[PDB]
Amino acid sequence: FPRVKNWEVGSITYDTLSAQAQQDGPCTPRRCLGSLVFPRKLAPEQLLSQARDFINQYYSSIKRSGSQAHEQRLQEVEAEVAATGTYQLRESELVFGAKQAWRNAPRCVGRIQWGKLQVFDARDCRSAQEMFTYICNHIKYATNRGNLRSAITVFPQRCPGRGDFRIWNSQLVRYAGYRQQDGSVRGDPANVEITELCIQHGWTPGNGRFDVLPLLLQAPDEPPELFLLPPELVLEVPLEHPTLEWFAALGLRWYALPAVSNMLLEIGGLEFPAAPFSGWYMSTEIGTRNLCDPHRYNILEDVAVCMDLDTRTTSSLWKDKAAVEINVAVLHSYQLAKVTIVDHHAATASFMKHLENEQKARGGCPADWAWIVPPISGSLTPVFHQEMVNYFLSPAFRYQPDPW
Amino acid sequence: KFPRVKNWEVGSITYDTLSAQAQQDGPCTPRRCLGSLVFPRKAPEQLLSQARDFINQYYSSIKRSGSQAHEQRLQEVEAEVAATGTYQLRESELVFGAKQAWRNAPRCVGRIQWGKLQVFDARDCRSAQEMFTYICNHIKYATNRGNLRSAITVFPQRCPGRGDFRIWNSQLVRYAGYRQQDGSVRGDPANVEITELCIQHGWTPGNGRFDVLPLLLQAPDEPPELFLLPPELVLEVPLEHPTLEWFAALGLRWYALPAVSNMLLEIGGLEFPAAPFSGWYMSTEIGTRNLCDPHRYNILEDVAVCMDLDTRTTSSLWKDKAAVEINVAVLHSYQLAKVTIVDHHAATASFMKHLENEQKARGGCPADWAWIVPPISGSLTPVFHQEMVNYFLSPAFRYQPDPW
Ligand code: HEM
Ligand code: HEM
Ligand SMILES: Cc1cc(CCNCc2ccc3c(C)cc(N)nc3c2)ccc1C#N
Ligand SMILES: Cc1cc(CCNCc2ccc3c(C)cc(N)nc3c2)ccc1C#N
Ligand SMILES: C[C@H](O)[C@H](O)[C@H]1CNc2nc(N)[nH]c(=O)c2N1
Ligand SMILES: C[C@H](O)[C@H](O)[C@H]1CNc2nc(N)[nH]c(=O)c2N1
Ligand SMILES: [Cl-]
Ligand SMILES: [Cl-]
Ligand SMILES: [Gd]
Ligand SMILES: [Gd]
Ligand SMILES: [Zn+2]
């Protein structure tokens, strides 16, 4: 039972929950690879064992373990799989599982919210046109005029034989990335290839560096088809700074809904290759990673010139200055636009509050220190000073091969 | 079957083949990662097997592997263990061994410099008194009027029949920390304990915030003897801000020389429980950590208030702005005072070049990601976007329990 220490306060806890971890990670006694982005690189009696485990923790969570429908529910799943091969989750189960998977995501710092999540059951989806509308309710419910609300939309569970439901964008909202003669990129370089894939599937390209990509929706077997997004659904926030009057002129924007459409949801041994979830942003996500990363928008030097900073020596800390202002402008702009956004201090502190809750409840909490600590001011936040154990619980969100 | 490691800023891929030589064992299993633990740790035949390895490394590096002088040294060593249960390092072997320990230190961002290390051989040392003299000398050579040099002093190896040489002080230069009427601490809270010890061993405490502590030096089978550092030996840098003239009225200071004095040095099974070593500071250790940590000097709010920042709300990023100014002061005061210092941007850049040097050389490089990334501006620096393999090689520096 790992002794975990907090070094800011001197407190000590034990992670007993780690004990019940299953799907083995990447690390060994001889070398730690906790800093890898992809940990686990990418006869049906394995289905049942995973299934009984989820069902047991389901009834555990409602007290009704032992006797009652608990006893009963084990048989239905048993018989279902015995007959069919796969099984269907009761609707309440699918809601329980989806929340658990969130609660088990080690790299997410928003888990203090894990209990408040809106699940939309689209297991009766059957078409790309059908997927599209489902996506469009979600985005509408999630966005909610900038009063953002955590939502997941679950599409049919992958079944033995015959193809998957899948979304080809990594997110629902993505800006375009265009190559050229230079080999450089106008727009967002993170989305250069999916822009490549859009155009070659019949999308008329665009102007420049904030062009919302269209979706690519893949119904089982049948190849993908584009689906243009309604401009009013895709809520955005133009970027201005509270005191640096020139910032708006730079013409920076960013969307309101972070919504991931490529990760694979697993509950009770069932794989959902299409299960888009959305929450709301932490400001450093936009201000530090998306706009400042050398391989993203890389705007840091442009902001620094306009601030008339000394970019000639790295010891003026012009990078650190520019970056704080780019962050101040993000929080400001989202607030002016009355769109839900959380700063990193506010967020990390709430995560600490989550760790203590998760101690009392489950005897621990799987966390990925490198992803929980923010990309700026790491040591200024409490989670820097907090030892963390990382492991894999089910249900969870996994990564999956892209469909190319 | 060697770890694939990717640089996410540039897209580079390399495999860490050096990790498969990992001579000791870390805290991680495939069930759970524990890389965020500060303390990831805690017979003649084994002393031989460690020793043979070191000797092998040594004769590899002088391009004289598998030769007369090599097999000589093996036979000589494994026969000296027979007669005494120990063996002695030749001086050249000691110098190579001290560098390697630095080279292998996974938590050191300044390893680009590993080859330029001045090794003082004090294995003939005889008392706590000769010990003090050797230390004063180390401080004098290393400080060098503000133009700092890397050195290490190696006191006599742990041996059968005798007690250890031990320096009780975590670092050669440390500020006192005094408990209070409030129950609070005056000066540096990291050194409340050592301060307690010094006082009880006859030191006459001051009452300032930057009272330099005396040394407690332990010669074999002797109580620790207390030694005052000659004031003119301890070069300090008074902290001022280049455009916030009220800053100098904080009365903040720091010392030039980061000399760690309580770590064990391990060479071919031989253990040196006293071998103080020193480099020069990276500005964040002073700016971010030593001053802004809530549990250290904790000046963050007091600076931010003085900056007339709005400390009511976190979304104002008051913590981040105040921190960036504290760092700017550190780099500036030190540059003014003509006292060597490196910024985290410059530091992280040379570390990347180190990783590149190391891959060509040994096919890899041990690195603790969460230590390498600066406690501010992580993603702004290149080490944020680099995956790293953590493992233990020998020679090495290790933590060791306090002798009290
Ligand atoms: C509601 C507010 C939320 C906040 C503030 C939040 C915060 C974050 C942040 C900052 C990340 C880092 C991702 C990155 O930097 O690339 C993250 C990742 C993640 N979040 Fe949350 N999140 C929220 C909602 C949700 C919801 C609703 C779910 C699932 C239903 C979720 C599950 C995840 C997962 C699985 C990851 C890992 C992403 C990956 O590995 O690519 N989060 N979260
Ligand atoms: C010359 C410039 C040097 C720089 C800029 C530098 C930088 C650093 C920094 C920033 C840390 C982390 C400190 C902390 O987080 O508390 C560290 C740790 C460490 N460094 Fe270096 N260093 C230098 C020289 C040296 C030398 C000369 C040695 C040994 C011969 C060394 C060996 C180590 C070791 C063993 C650690 C781990 C200390 C621990 O675990 O507490 N470094 N270094
Ligand atoms: C595997 C991978 C992962 C990532 C990170 C993607 N995760 C982004 C994300 C995903 C979900 C979020 C959610 C749900 C909320 C939020 N505030 N931010 C979120 C951010 C980037 C590139 C790769 C790659 N290759
Ligand atoms: C185990 C432990 C470790 C640390 C880390 C302290 N390391 C300090 C250090 C040690 C050597 C340095 C060197 C050699 C150079 C440099 N710039 N900074 C250095 C800083 C702090 C508290 C504890 C505790 N308890
Ligand atoms: C190699 C390293 O793990 C990688 O760059 C990680 C570090 N931490 C991160 N943390 C978050 N939230 N998002 C990221 O993309 C990354 N990148
Ligand atoms: C618990 C946590 O890992 C701990 O506070 C670490 C994080 N990374 C660090 N990195 C460095 N360089 N120095 C440190 O003291 C720490 N502290
Ligand atoms: Cl994003
Ligand atoms: Cl220090
Ligand atoms: Gd101007
Ligand atoms: Gd001024
Ligand atoms: Zn690990």
Where, residue-wise, is CATH 3.90.340.10 in chain B?
A: 16-124+150-160+264-278+348-372
Residue range B16-124+150-160+264-278+348-372 in CATH 3.90.340.10: yes
User: Strands of B215-218's sheet, edge to edge?
Assistant: B166-167, B215-218, B225-227
* Beta carbons of A317 and B331 less than 8 Å apart: yes
Q: Which CATH number fits domain B125-149+164-235+399-403: 3.40.190.10, 3.40.50.2020, 3.90.1310.10, 3.90.440.10?
A: 3.90.440.10
Q: Which residue has the tokens 């936040």?
A: A381
Cβ-contact A134, A215 below 8 angstroms: no
Determine how many CB atoms are found less than 10 A away from the CB of residue A327. 24
Q: Which residues does A142 contact at the CB level (< 8 Å), separation at least 6?
A: A148, A149, A150, A151, A257, A259, A278
CA of B360 from ligand 5 middle (Å) equals: 26
Resolution (A): 2.4
* Smallest-distance ligand from the CA of A173: 7
- Quote the tokens at residue B83: 């007669």
Cβ-contact B310, B372 below 8 angstroms: no
Closest CA to A2 of B32, B400, B24, B392: B32
Determine how many CB atoms are found less than 10 A away from the CB of residue A96. 23
Please say if B246 is a catalytic residue: no
Which residues, in sequence order, are bridge partners of residue A236? A255
B144: left (phi over 0), alpha (psi -120 to 50) or beta: left
User: How far is Cα A189 from Cα A11, in angstroms, rounded to an integer?
Assistant: 43
- The three state secondary structure string of chain B is CCCEEEECCCCEEEECCHHHHCCCCCCCCCCCECCCCCCCCCCHHHHHHHHHHHHHHHHHHCCCCCCHHHHHHHHHHHHHHHHHCCCCCCHHHHHHHHHHHHHHCCCCCCHHHCCCCEEEECCCCCCHHHHHHHHHHHHHHHHHHHCCCCEEEECCCCCCCCCCCEECCCECCCECEEECCCCCEEECHHHHHHHHHHHHCCCCCCCCCCCECCEEEECCCCCCEEECCCHHHCCEEECCCCCCCCHHHHCCEEECCCEECCCEEEECCEEECCCCEECCCEHHHHHHHHHHCCCCCCCHHHHHHHCCCCCCCHHHCHHHHHHHHHHHHHHHHHHHCCCCCECHHHHHHHHHHHHHHHHHHHCCCCCCHHHHCCCCCHHHCHHHHECCCECCCCCEEECCCCCC
Q: Which residues does B280 contact at the CB level (< 8 Å), separation at least 6?
A: B148, B150, B256, B257, B258, B340, B341, B342
Which residues, in sequence order, are bridge partners of residue A255? A236
Q: Which residues does A94 contact at the CB level (< 8 Å), separation at least 6?
A: A119, A121, A123, A154, A267
Determine how many CB atoms are found less than 10 A away from the CB of residue B308. 7
Find the catalytic residue in A102, A254, A280, A318.
A280
By DSSP bridging, strand B12-15 and strand B4-7 are antiparallel
| Residues of chain B positioned with their CB less than 8 A from the CB of A35 | 35, 369-370, 387-388, 390
By DSSP bridging, strand A215-218 and strand A225-227 are antiparallel
Residue A20: burial class (beta carbons within 10 Å; 0-12, 13-18, 19+): middle
- List ligand 3's pocket residues with C-beta within 6 A: A 37, 258, 260, 277, 279-282, 285, 399
- Quote the tokens at residue A365: 């909490």
Rg (CA), chain B: 23
CA of B335 from ligand 10 middle (Å) equals: 19
Q: Which residues does B84 contact at the CB level (< 8 Å), separation at least 6?
A: B160
By DSSP bridging, strand A177-178 and strand B277-278 are unpaired
Phi/psi at B309 (nearest 5 deg)? -65, 160
Where, residue-wise, is CATH 3.90.440.10 in chain A?
A: 124-149+164-235+399-403
Cβ-contact B399, B41 below 8 angstroms: yes
If one looks up domain A124-149+164-235+399-403 in CATH, what number appears? 3.90.440.10
User: How far is Cα A104 from Cα B379, in angstroms, rounded to an integer?
Assistant: 25
- Quote the tokens at residue A310: 């000394």
User: How far is Cα A337 from Cα A256, in angstroms, rounded to an integer?
Assistant: 10
Experimental determination technique: X-ray
Phi/psi at A236 (nearest 5 deg)? -135, 160
Cβ-contact A95, A114 below 8 angstroms: no
Q: Which residues does B359 contact at the CB level (< 8 Å), separation at least 6?
A: B14, B365
Q: Which residues does B26 contact at the CB level (< 8 Å), separation at least 6?
A: A29, A30, A31, A32, B34, B40, B41, B390, B391, B392
**In this structure, which residue's CA is closest to atom 16 in ligand 6?**
B371
Closest CA to B335 of B263, B240, B245, B243: B240
Determine how many CB atoms are found less than 10 A away from the CB of residue B196. 15
Q: Which CATH number fits domain A15-123+150-160+264-278+348-372: 3.30.2140.20, 3.40.50.620, 3.90.340.10, 3.90.1150.10?
A: 3.90.340.10
B42 → chain A, closest CA residue: A3
- Quote the tokens at residue A274: 């299409």
B335 → chain A, closest CA residue: A315
Cβ-contact A304, A222 below 8 angstroms: no
Please say if B91 is a catalytic residue: no
User: How far is Cα B89 from Cα B268, in angstroms, rounded to an integer?
Assistant: 9
- Quote the tokens at residue A228: 């243009």
Q: Which residue has the tokens 């005029």?
A: A145
**Helix (H) or strand (E) segment spanning residue A72:** helix A68-83
Where, residue-wise, is CATH 3.90.1230.10 in chain B?
A: 236-258+281-346
Rg (CA), chain A: 23
The residue type found at B34 is: L
Closest CA to A57 of A100, A108, A89: A100
CA of B376 from ligand 2 middle (Å) equals: 17
Comparing CB atoms, the residue among A33, A37, A321 nearest residue B8 is A37
> At how many degrees (to 10) do helices A45-61 and A68-83 cross?
160
Closest CA to A169 of A159, A177, A161: A177
Where, residue-wise, is CATH 3.90.340.10 in chain A?
A: 15-123+150-160+264-278+348-372
Please say if A254 is a catalytic residue: no
| Residues of chain B positioned with their CB less than 8 A from the CB of A34 | 28, 33, 35-36, 369, 390
Cβ-contact B209, B299 below 8 angstroms: no
A310 SS3 class: coil
Q: Which residues does B355 contact at the CB level (< 8 Å), separation at least 6?
A: B365, B367, B386
User: How far is Cα B158 from Cα B142, in angstroms, rounded to an integer?
Assistant: 25
Closest CA to A342 of A287, A280, A256: A280
Q: Which residue has the tokens 């503000």?
A: B146
CA atoms within a 13 Å half-sphere pointing along the CA-CB vector of B144: 12
Residue B63: burial class (beta carbons within 10 Å; 0-12, 13-18, 19+): exposed
The residue type found at B396 is: A
Please say if A107 is a catalytic residue: no
Cβ-contact A320, B381 below 8 angstroms: no
B293 Cβ inside 6 Å of ligand 6: no
Closest CA to A267 of A91, A37, A83: A91
Comparing CB atoms, the residue among B28, B36, B373 nearest residue A387 is B36
A26 → chain B, closest CA residue: B30
A370 Cβ inside 6 Å of ligand 6: no
Q: Which residue has the tokens 């180190």?
A: B354
User: How far is Cα B331 from Cα A33, in angstroms, rounded to an integer?
Assistant: 33
For residue B395, cis peptide bond before it (omega within 30 degrees of 0):
yes
A162 SS3 class: coil
User: How far is Cα B261 from Cα A4, in angstroms, rounded to an integer?
Assistant: 26
By DSSP bridging, strand A396-398 and strand A264-267 are antiparallel
If you classify domain B236-258+281-346 with CATH, what class do you get?
A: alpha beta
Which residues, in sequence order, are bridge partners of residue A252? A239
User: How far is Cα A150 from Cα A119, in angstroms, rounded to an integer?
Assistant: 9
Closest CA to A368 of A347, A346, A349, A383: A383
From residue A243, give the alpha-carbon distance in Å to each of A184, A240, A248, A333, A356. 32, 9, 11, 12, 39
Cβ-contact A267, A54 below 8 angstroms: yes
User: How far is Cα A247 from Cα B207, in angstroms, rounded to an integer?
Assistant: 49
User: How far is Cα B392 from Cα B41, in angstroms, rounded to an integer?
Assistant: 11
User: How far is Cα A384 from Cα B293, in angstroms, rounded to an integer?
Assistant: 10
Cβ-contact B132, B215 below 8 angstroms: yes
Cβ-contact B175, B291 below 8 angstroms: no
Cβ-contact A144, A152 below 8 angstroms: no
User: How far is Cα B336 from Cα A315, in angstroms, rounded to an integer?
Assistant: 13
From residue A166, give the alpha-carbon distance in Å to each of A38, A101, A155, A162, B270. 20, 19, 9, 13, 59
CA of B259 from ligand 2 middle (Å) equals: 9
Closest CA to A389 of A13, A11, A18: A18
| Known binding-site residue numbers of A | 27, 32, 35, 108, 171, 280-281, 285, 289-290, 370-371, 384, 399
By DSSP bridging, strand A118-121 and strand A151-154 are parallel
Cβ-contact B118, B150 below 8 angstroms: yes
The residue type found at A344 is: H
User: How far is Cα A113 from Cα A110, in angstroms, rounded to an integer?
Assistant: 6
Where, residue-wise, is CATH 3.90.440.10 in chain B?
A: 125-149+164-235+399-403
Comparing CB atoms, the residue among B6, B292, B379 nearest residue A289 is B379
Min Cα–Cα distance to chain A from B172, Å: 23
Closest CA to B26 of B384, B355, B393: B393
**In this structure, which residue's CA is closest to atom 5 in ligand 6?**
A385
Phi/psi at A299 (nearest 5 deg)? -95, 0
Phi/psi at B305 (nearest 5 deg)? -55, -50
- Quote the tokens at residue B300: 């963050």
Mutate to test the interface with B, among A8, A13, A16, A33 (most CBs of B within 10 A): A33
Phi/psi at A348 (nearest 5 deg)? -60, -45
User: How far is Cα B91 from Cα B103, in angstroms, rounded to an integer?
Assistant: 18
Give the position, in ligand 1's atom list, of the atom nearest the Cα of A396.
35
User: How far is Cα A24 from Cα B20, in angstroms, rounded to an integer?
Assistant: 20
Q: Which residue has the tokens 């390895």?
A: B53
